[PDB]
Amino acid sequence: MAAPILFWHRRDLRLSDNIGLAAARAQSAQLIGLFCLDPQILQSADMAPARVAYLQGCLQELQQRYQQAGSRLLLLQGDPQHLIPQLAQQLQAEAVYWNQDIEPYGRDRDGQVAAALKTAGIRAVQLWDQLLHSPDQILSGSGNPYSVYGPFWKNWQAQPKPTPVATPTELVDLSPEQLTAIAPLLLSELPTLKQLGFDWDGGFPVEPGETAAIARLQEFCDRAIADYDPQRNFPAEAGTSGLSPALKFGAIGIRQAWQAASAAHALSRSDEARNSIRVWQQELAWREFYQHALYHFPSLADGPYRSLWQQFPWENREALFTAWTQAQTGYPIVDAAMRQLTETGWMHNRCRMIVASFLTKDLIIDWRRGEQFFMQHLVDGDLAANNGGWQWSASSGMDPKPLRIFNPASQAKKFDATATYIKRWLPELRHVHPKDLISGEITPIERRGYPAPIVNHNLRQKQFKALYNQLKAAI
Ligand SMILES: Cc1cc2nc3c(=O)[nH]c(=O)nc-3n(C[C@@H](O)[C@H](O)[C@@H](O)COP(=O)(O)OP(=O)(O)OC[C@H]3O[C@@H](n4cnc5c(N)ncnc54)[C@H](O)[C@@H]3O)c2cc1C
Numbered sequence: 333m334a335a336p337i338l339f340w341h342r343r344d345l346r347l348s349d350n351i352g353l354a355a356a357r358a359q360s361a362q363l364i365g366l367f368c369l370d371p372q373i374l375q376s377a378d379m380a381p382a383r384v385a386y387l388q389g390c391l392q393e394l395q396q397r398y399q400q401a402g403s404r405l406l407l408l409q410g411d412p413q414h415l416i417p418q419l420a421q422q423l424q425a426e427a428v429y430w431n432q433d434i435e436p437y438g439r440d441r442d443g444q445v446a447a448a449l450k451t452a453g454i455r456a457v458q459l460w461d462q463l464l465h466s467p468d469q470i471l472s473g474s475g476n477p478y479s480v481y482g483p484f485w486k487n488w489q490a491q492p493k494p495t496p497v498a499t500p501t502e503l504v505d506l507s508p509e510q511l512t513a514i515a516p517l518l519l520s521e522l523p524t525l526k527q528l529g530f531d532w533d534g535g536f537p538v539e540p541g542e543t544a545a546i547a548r549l550q551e552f553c554d555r556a557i558a559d560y561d562p563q564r565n566f567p568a569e570a571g572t573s574g575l576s577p578a579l580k581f582g583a584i585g586i587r588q589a590w591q592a593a594s595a596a597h598a599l600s601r602s603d604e605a606r607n608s609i610r611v612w613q614q615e616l617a618w619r620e621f622y623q624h625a626l627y628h629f630p631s632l633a634d635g636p637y638r639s640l641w642q643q644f645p646w647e648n649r650e651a652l653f654t655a656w657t658q659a660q661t662g663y664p665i666v667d668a669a670m671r672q673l674t675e676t677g678w679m680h681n682r683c684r685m686i687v688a689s690f691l692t693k694d695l696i697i698d699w700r701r702g703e704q705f706f707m708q709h710l711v712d713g714d715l716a717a718n719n720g721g722w723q724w725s726a727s728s729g730m731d732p733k734p735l736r737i738f739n740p741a742s743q744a745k746k747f748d749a750t751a752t753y754i755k756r757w758l759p760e761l762r763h764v765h766p767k768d769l770i771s772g773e774i775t776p777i778e779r780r781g782y783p784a785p786i787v788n789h790n791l792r793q794k795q796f797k798a799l800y801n802q803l804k805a806a807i
């Protein structure tokens with residue numbers, strides 16, 4: 333009990349399995365939560381309507397959970413460097429708790445806020461919550477960060493795994509006197525999506541909120557997971573969890589997700605299952621690899637990390653970029669993926685690799701243009717993972733690899749052999765023959781209004797290799 337402790341939420345929108353929140357409840361029952369609508373983020377051109385819609389639904393639930401627990405979630409709108417210390421001063425808060433992040437913006441903001449709180453004589457405690465292992469814990473024998481997945485995985489996998497922490501209960505709300513002291517800093521109501529200027533009708537991979545995310549984890553683990561491998565390969569198959577946005581925003585705790593995978597892996601008697609489960613567990617490790625990477629090498633966010641890739645002579649033809657964004661490339665597998673993206677705010681992972689390779693190696697456009705278009709549409713848009721996926725398409729950052737220019741055709745054959753996914757997103761081509769949809773060779777008569785390939789794959793492959801080889805001669 334005692335004076336109030338403020339817990340500042342940002343990307344951990346849940347009451348359960350929250351490290352910082354659990355640590356705070358151990359210090360006082362007068363635990364008040366807050367979320368600050370930050371214009372520097374919400375007004376950025378990098379916002380996606382699906383993503384704000386998801387965020388807004390998570391906050392609605394969180395307001396309720398706090399009310400049910402005994403206190404409330406305070407809502408502010410403005411610059412946190414200014415509003416957080418002021419709010420804490422007015423409430424003479426004993427401390428302000430929050431969970432650390434890996435993003436440059438987040439880390440700079442947090443330092444300023446912490447500095448301001450100290451100046452005010454108020455304690456700020458920042459703990460690690462969104463990762464099973466913090467960036468400081470996973471280092472090589474020489475005490476250096478990993479820039480290659482292999483060694484990172486062997487280390488990460490051998491570390492003892494933490495257990496989910498308890499959900500705080502029996503909280504005590506603020507008094508009328510305290511509410512009066514802060515009234516001028518508060519928002520009276522959670523704004524609606526239209527009030528923020530966004531609209532979204534495309535649905536979600538998982539419904540917003542802590543309850544839904546938890547329900548989905550349980551469900552994925554009682555059935556799906558067992559078949560993860562190889563079901564995750566096929567875009568037509570609903571083989572993945574659909575939890576990506578819940579993990580981006582912390583609607584589900586990472587220790588709860590790992591624990592569920594552990595349990596499922598033990599109850600499983602089939603060796604095939606035990607494998608699908610271990611494959612999903614590695615996907616959680618890829619997530620941390622990319623988050624630790626941005627933490628250790630922040631410059632990654634600025635563009636190509638490897639020097640030569642910084643000098644690459646991208647062609648950058650706007651006309652090709654536009655057709656890409658509009659799903660008018662003429663390459664079925666590609667256009668189908670781009671339609672799923674813009675219509676639903678989500679895209680199967682195999683398709684993200686395919687459209688990324690396409691933009692970088694076929695269209696020869698600086699991948700940063702693609703990185704930004706993705707952030708503007710993805711419900712799970714996440715700087716670390718998106719930047720990691722795009723650097724991947726060019727081997728310009730972490731975990732590099734030898735050149736390999738994909739053939740959309742081949743990929744289609746491999747992952748959409750029957751063209752089910754393609755026709756799902758390109759109905760105007762339902763009449764066409766799989767063989768044709770996979771190959772991309774459609775007769776002008778049965779293919780309709782649908783465009784012809786905007787580029788010739790083989791001519792593009794040579795062009796790219798040529799630009800790449802010329803360059804290698806001056807590095
Ligand atoms: C170009 C590109 C951009 C990407 N952008 C994002 C993005 O902005 N946000 C995002 O969450 N993921 C991104 N990824 C990875 C991506 O494929 C997603 O994690 C998505 O497919 C998850 O769907 P799911 O939740 O069903 O995944 P599952 O297969 O169920 O995996 C479970 C969780 O593991 C994590 N994960 C899975 N694959 C990866 C991966 N390759 N890298 C990092 N984490 C991974 C995610 O948190 C995911 O929710 C990107 C990948 C590429 C190639």
Ligand SMILES: O=c1nc2n(C[C@@H](O)[C@H](O)[C@@H](O)CO)c3cc(O)ccc3cc-2c(=O)[nH]1
Binds near residue numbers: 371387439
């Ligand atoms: O504190 C906030 N965090 C927001 N975040 C959550 C976090 O990513 C976080 O603030 C930072 O750590 C990002 O550096 C958003 C993330 C999105 O992708 C989209 C919108 C937001 C909006 C906010 C916001 O208004 N306030």
